[PDB]
């Protein structure tokens, strides 16, 4: 027979790019822009729950574990994909949040935008610097989902460890499909994602609690952010680093 490759499977469960429906006819405010991004983000996260579910192995975790991983890593998954789309669609020059919603120079210049957009372009330019391939990206994306765990560790740490084993192998296969040196670089990029995202989480928590700014969040994200917020205060959240 010949089981289809795990790469080929990842390729087909990769979600299709969502659409913002952003109306560039009305005037650009920064509360408006951020509230849009959050709404779009809400949708991307739903799209990412579907993806995780179709993910060979993911389902064998305890439901607590699936929660924990999706809660702890959503912002990384989203920023990673964003970085990818910006890499493809504009070669890392502009944030391509959707095809109907790109960030240009007006709207990076809007209040609050420049800082946060700088950080997300950093992610983008890594893909540029390392000429990352689609297959490399897909495996790295799975490893991102599996990169943050409670300091307590997970319930079914058993299954957890074997899942990482698989996708680390998969990452290696992908490196090949496109040479010892490469795997180092990539696991270093995975490592450096924790820092690159920490800033985004910080600003996110700010716009979430700052009542004056009237940045709206979909109930999807709000529920996650509200749950995550005491856990980051306690600092009870462990990055898995390769180095």
């Amino acid at each position: 027979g010949e089981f289809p490759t795990l790469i080929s499977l990842l390729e087909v469960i990769e979600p299709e790019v969502l659409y913002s429906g952003y109306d560039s006819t009305l005037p650009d405010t920064s509360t408006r822009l951020m509230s849009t991004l959050n709404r779009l983000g809400g949708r991307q996260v739903v799209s990412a729950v579907k993806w995780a579910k179709a993910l060979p192995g993911f389902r064998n975790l305890h439901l607590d574990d699936q929660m924990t991983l999706l809660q702890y890593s959503w912002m990384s998954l989203m920023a990673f994909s964003l970085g990818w789309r910006s890499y493809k669609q504009s070669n890392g020059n502009m944030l391509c949040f959707a095809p109907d919603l790109v960030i240009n120079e007006e709207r990076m210049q809007l209040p609050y935008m420049y800082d946060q957009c700088q950080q997300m372009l950093k992610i983008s330019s890594e893909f540029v610097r390392l000429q990352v391939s689609y297959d490399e990206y897909l495996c790295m994306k799975v490893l991102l989902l599996l990169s943050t765990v409670p300091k307590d560790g997970l319930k079914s740490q058993a299954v957890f460890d074997e899942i990482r084993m698989t996708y680390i192998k998969e990452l290696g296969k992908a490196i090949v499909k496109r040479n010892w040196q490469r795997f180092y670089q990539l696991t270093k990029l995975l490592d450096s994602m924790h820092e690159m995202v920490g800033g985004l989480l910080q600003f996110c928590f700010y716009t979430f609690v700052n009542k004056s700014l009237s940045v709206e969040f979909p109930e999807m994200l709000a529920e996650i952010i509200s749950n995550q917020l005491p856990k980051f205060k306690a600092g009870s959240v462990k990055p898995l680093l390769f180095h």
């Binding site: 699936q66 109930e219 996650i224």
Partner: peptide, 11 residues
């Protein structure tokens, strides 16, 4: 527990 997320996982 994030009710919508939990929900999406249990369907």
């Amino acid at each position: 527990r994030p009710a919508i997320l939990y929900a999406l996982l249990s369907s």
